[PDB]
Design an enzyme around this catalytic site. Structure first.
Site, PDB file in Angstrom:
ATOM      1  CE  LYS A  56     -44.988  53.432 -96.145  1.00 21.32           C
ATOM      2  NZ  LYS A  56     -44.202  53.088 -97.614  1.00 21.32           N
ATOM      3  CG  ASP A  77     -37.576  58.143-104.593  1.00 21.71           C
ATOM      4  OD1 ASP A  77     -36.764  58.793-105.487  1.00 21.71           O
ATOM      5  OD2 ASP A  77     -38.765  57.807-104.521  1.00 21.71           O
ATOM      6  N   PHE A 135     -49.712  54.271-103.150  1.00 21.52           N
ATOM      7  CA  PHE A 135     -48.844  53.415-102.327  1.00 21.52           C
ATOM      8  C   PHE A 135     -49.206  53.295-100.957  1.00 21.52           C
ATOM      9  N   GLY A 136     -50.353  54.052-100.488  1.00 19.24           N
ATOM     10  CA  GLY A 136     -50.860  54.135 -98.980  1.00 19.24           C
ATOM     11  C   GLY A 136     -51.312  55.393 -98.426  1.00 19.24           C
TER      12      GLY A 136
HETATM   13  C1  LIG Z   1     -42.980  64.224 -88.946  1.00 20.15           C
HETATM   14  C2  LIG Z   1     -42.773  62.578 -89.457  1.00 20.15           C
HETATM   15  O1  LIG Z   1     -42.321  61.969 -88.766  1.00 20.15           O
HETATM   16  N1  LIG Z   1     -43.328  62.304 -90.681  1.00 20.15           N
HETATM   17  C3  LIG Z   1     -43.272  61.274 -91.331  1.00 20.15           C
HETATM   18  C4  LIG Z   1     -42.766  59.901 -90.892  1.00 20.15           C
HETATM   19  N2  LIG Z   1     -43.057  59.085 -91.867  1.00 20.15           N
HETATM   20  C5  LIG Z   1     -42.858  57.624 -92.042  1.00 20.15           C
HETATM   21  C6  LIG Z   1     -43.203  56.990 -93.252  1.00 20.15           C
HETATM   22  C7  LIG Z   1     -42.853  55.572 -93.190  1.00 20.15           C
HETATM   23  C8  LIG Z   1     -41.841  55.167 -94.087  1.00 20.15           C
HETATM   24  C9  LIG Z   1     -41.763  53.625 -94.231  1.00 20.15           C
HETATM   25  N3  LIG Z   1     -40.587  53.337 -94.994  1.00 20.15           N
HETATM   26  C10 LIG Z   1     -39.583  53.783 -95.147  1.00 20.15           C
HETATM   27  O2  LIG Z   1     -39.043  54.923 -94.914  1.00 20.15           O
HETATM   28  C11 LIG Z   1     -38.395  53.026 -96.025  1.00 20.15           C
HETATM   29  C12 LIG Z   1     -38.881  52.353 -97.142  1.00 20.15           C
HETATM   30  C13 LIG Z   1     -38.100  51.446 -97.771  1.00 20.15           C
HETATM   31  C14 LIG Z   1     -36.584  51.656 -97.497  1.00 20.15           C
HETATM   32  C15 LIG Z   1     -36.266  52.598 -96.607  1.00 20.15           C
HETATM   33  C16 LIG Z   1     -34.758  52.717 -96.310  1.00 20.15           C
HETATM   34  F1  LIG Z   1     -34.247  52.310 -95.185  1.00 20.15           F
HETATM   35  F2  LIG Z   1     -34.197  52.288 -97.541  1.00 20.15           F
HETATM   36  F3  LIG Z   1     -34.265  54.003 -96.458  1.00 20.15           F
HETATM   37  C17 LIG Z   1     -37.131  53.296 -95.913  1.00 20.15           C
HETATM   38  C18 LIG Z   1     -42.531  52.859 -93.312  1.00 20.15           C
HETATM   39  C19 LIG Z   1     -43.637  53.363 -92.640  1.00 20.15           C
HETATM   40  C20 LIG Z   1     -43.914  55.040 -92.481  1.00 20.15           C
HETATM   41  C21 LIG Z   1     -44.744  55.146 -91.472  1.00 20.15           C
HETATM   42  C22 LIG Z   1     -43.862  57.861 -94.201  1.00 20.15           C
HETATM   43  C23 LIG Z   1     -43.880  58.971 -94.194  1.00 20.15           C
HETATM   44  C24 LIG Z   1     -43.590  59.715 -93.126  1.00 20.15           C
HETATM   45  N4  LIG Z   1     -43.862  61.148 -92.501  1.00 20.15           N
END
Ligand SMILES: CC(=O)Nc1cn2cc(-c3cc(NC(=O)c4cccc(C(F)(F)F)c4)ccc3C)ccc2n1
Length: 253
Positions: free
Chosen positions: A35, A128, A20-21
């Site tokens: 991401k 999730d 997914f990326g």
């Molecule tokens: C140490 C540290 O900071 N590590 C870290 C930070 N990260 C951030 C992401 C990340 C996650 C998203 N999307 C969502 O979170 C998302 C998507 C849909 C619904 C909802 C909800 F709002 F419904 F919850 C939330 C977009 C972009 C990034 C960069 C992934 C992995 C990660 N690892």
């Protein structure tokens, strides 16, 4: 607007990779998490999933939600969020076996219920929720997001395991499993080594989390709330305004 000006994001270390990326620790007015979709040119289904994810994220402004910061489309489709300090609740409970005091556990529960109530009020079904998606920022503040790149059937409500079966109540079931993790320090069904069998049994209502495993110091009210959240009949499950009121009441003891 949340479109980040082209050529401002710098990506450093790759901290996660899937289908997914890819997630990198980047730089954009300090440390950020970036991401990206690996492909230089994306599918119209990929462009839509990106647009939908930004649509949900741009609706959220709450201390218990991973902070969305912006997006880029050039050179690649990218979603930028804050960079957290610490580890997921999953890491704490199941890998480094952090032994939190009961007051702190009830606090993690309250903060998770706080973010879930915020999402549900904005009409966002997480779909999730699990302890890996609960980050303990500075070892103090719960930040809910979707940190994954792919599933995870332990937090799946019986009707989600069967077969849209997602609702506010299916999120509540996943929250019940999180309470189970907090109050036992363990994942449910640890004595079963067969994935398909867990899926089949939860779905048929044959297997359910063993509540007799909850800590001795776990309040009677907390055990009741957990059982209520884990009810096989989704309509029998409390909603987050009620869950939060139950947590805040037992916290005053
Ligand atoms: C140490 C540290 O900071 N590590 C870290 C930070 N990260 C951030 C992401 C990340 C996650 C998203 N999307 C969502 O979170 C998302 C998507 C849909 C619904 C909802 C909800 F709002 F419904 F919850 C939330 C977009 C972009 C990034 C960069 C992934 C992995 C990660 N690892």
């Amino acid at each position: 607007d949340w479109e980040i000006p082209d050529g401002q994001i710098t990506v450093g270390q790759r901290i996660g990779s899937g289908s997914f990326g890819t997630v990198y620790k980047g730089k954009w007015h300090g440390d950020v998490a970036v991401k990206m979709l690996n492909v230089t040119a994306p599918t119209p289904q990929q462009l839509q999933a990106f647009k939908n994810e930004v649509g949900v994220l741009r609706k959220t402004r709450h201390v218990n939600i991973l902070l969305f910061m912006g997006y880029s489309t050039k050179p690649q489709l990218a979603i930028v969020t804050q960079w957290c300090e610490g580890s997921s609740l999953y890491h704490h409970l199941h890998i480094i076996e952090t032994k939190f005091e009961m007051i702190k556990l009830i606090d993690i529960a309250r903060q998770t219920a706080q973010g879930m109530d915020y999402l549900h009020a904005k009409s966002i079904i997480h779909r999730d929720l699990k302890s890996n998606n609960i980050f303990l920022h500075e070892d103090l503040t719960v930040k809910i997001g979707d940190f994954g790149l792919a599933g995870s059937i332990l937090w799946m409500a019986p009707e989600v395991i069967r077969m849209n079966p997602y609702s506010f109540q299916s999120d509540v079931y996943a929250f019940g499993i999180v309470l189970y993790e907090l109050m036992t320090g363990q994942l449910p069904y640890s004595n079963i080594n067969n994935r398909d069998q867990i899926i089949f049994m939860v779905g048929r209502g044959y297997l359910s989390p063993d509540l007799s495993k909850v800590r001795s110091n776990c309040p009677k009210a907390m055990k009741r709330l957990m059982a209520e959240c884990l009810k096989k009949k989704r309509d029998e499950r409390p909603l987050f305004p009620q869950i939060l009121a139950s947590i805040e009441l037992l916290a005053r003891s």
